[PDB]
């Protein structure tokens, strides 16, 4: 719901919130949104999301996250245009929290996403 964590990957930070696709990432440059959370949140990720998403995002700043960078968004879109399409028949409702923003009610705010230390895998 309002679970809005902060993360930084691919040299650009993004937002990771659980929604229709679970965690949703966003591009810091233009704060893009994973069209899946907007389209997949109302159409599930199936052969439909492959076209509806590609046809909806492909033309609407659709970015595919691969390699571990932006794998939380997958198909994020320009928040300026994403929120305009989501408010339509996307998740305008389920995104109540994502759009509300988790503001610190004045109480010490916890750190962004879970802090995890990378392990050393020597070949």
UniProtKB/Swiss-Prot annotation:
Residues 114-123 have a biased composition (Basic residues). Transmembrane segments: none annotated. It is found in: Nucleus. Residues 4-110 form the HTH APSES-type domain. Coiled coil: none annotated. The modification Phosphoserine is found at residue 109. Residues 35-56 bind DNA. It comes from the Eukaryota. Present with 521 molecules/cell in log phase SD medium. Component of the transcription complex MCB-binding factor (MBF) composed of SWI6 and MBP1. Interacts with MSA1. Binds to MCB elements (Mlu I cell cycle box) found in the promoter of most DNA synthesis genes. Transcriptional activation by MBF has an important role in the transition from G1 to S phase. It may have a dual role in that it behaves as an activator of transcription at the G1-S boundary and as a repressor during other stages of the cell cycle. This is Transcription factor MBP1. It comes from Saccharomyces cerevisiae (strain ATCC 204508 / S288c) (Baker's yeast).
């Amino acid at each position: 719901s309002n679970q809005i964590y902060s993360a930084r990957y691919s040299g650009v930070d993004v937002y990771e919130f659980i929604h229709s696709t679970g965690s949703i990432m966003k591009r810091k440059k233009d704060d893009w949104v994973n069209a899946t959370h907007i389209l997949k949140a109302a159409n599930f990720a199936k052969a439909k999301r492959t076209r509806i998403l590609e046809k909806e995002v492909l033309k609407e700043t659709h970015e595919k996250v691969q390699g571990g960078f932006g794998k939380y968004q997958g198909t994020w879109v320009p928040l300026n245009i994403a929120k305009q399409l989501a408010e339509k028949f996307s998740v305008y409702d389920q995104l109540k929290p994502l759009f509300d923003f988790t503001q610190t009610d004045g109480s010490a705010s916890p750190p962004p996403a879970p802090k995890h230390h990378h392990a050393s895998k020597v070949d």
